[PDB]
Amino acid sequence: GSSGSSGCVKCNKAITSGGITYQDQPWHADCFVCVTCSKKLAGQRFTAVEDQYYCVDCYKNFVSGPSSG
Ligand SMILES: [Zn+2]
Ligand SMILES: [Zn+2]
């Protein structure tokens, strides 16, 4: 029984009958979270950066921080 669909691009798991699609790509509500605090970006206001996606929470801190590294 070969059971393994492509699914999203994050966790690579089939998308339920109520997920989300970004940039013509299969994404999940949990996978569509910032690569920092893992916040639900879907529906909320987020910023897509060439590198990765950051929620208004992290973004603000990134664009406006004391020291990056
Ligand atoms: Zn996923
Ligand atoms: Zn975040």
Swiss-Prot record:
Residues 8-58 form the LIM zinc-binding domain. It comes from the Eukaryota. Isoform 1 is highly expressed in skeletal muscle and to a lesser extent in heart, placenta, ovary, prostate, testis, small intestine, colon and spleen. Expression is barely detectable in brain, lung, liver, kidney, pancreas, thymus and peripheral blood leukocytes. Isoform 2 is expressed in brain, skeletal muscle and to a lesser extent in heart, colon, prostate and small intestine. Isoform 3 is expressed in testis, heart and skeletal muscle. It is linked to Emery-Dreifuss muscular dystrophy 6, X-linked: A form of Emery-Dreifuss muscular dystrophy, a degenerative myopathy characterized by weakness and atrophy of muscle without involvement of the nervous system, early contractures of the elbows, Achilles tendons and spine, and cardiomyopathy associated with cardiac conduction defects. May have an involvement in muscle development or hypertrophy. (Microbial infection) Interacts (via LIM domain 1) with Chikungunya virus non-structural protein 3 (via C-terminus); this interaction is required for viral RNA replication. This is Four and a half LIM domains protein 1. The chain holds residues 162 to 217 of 323 of the full protein.
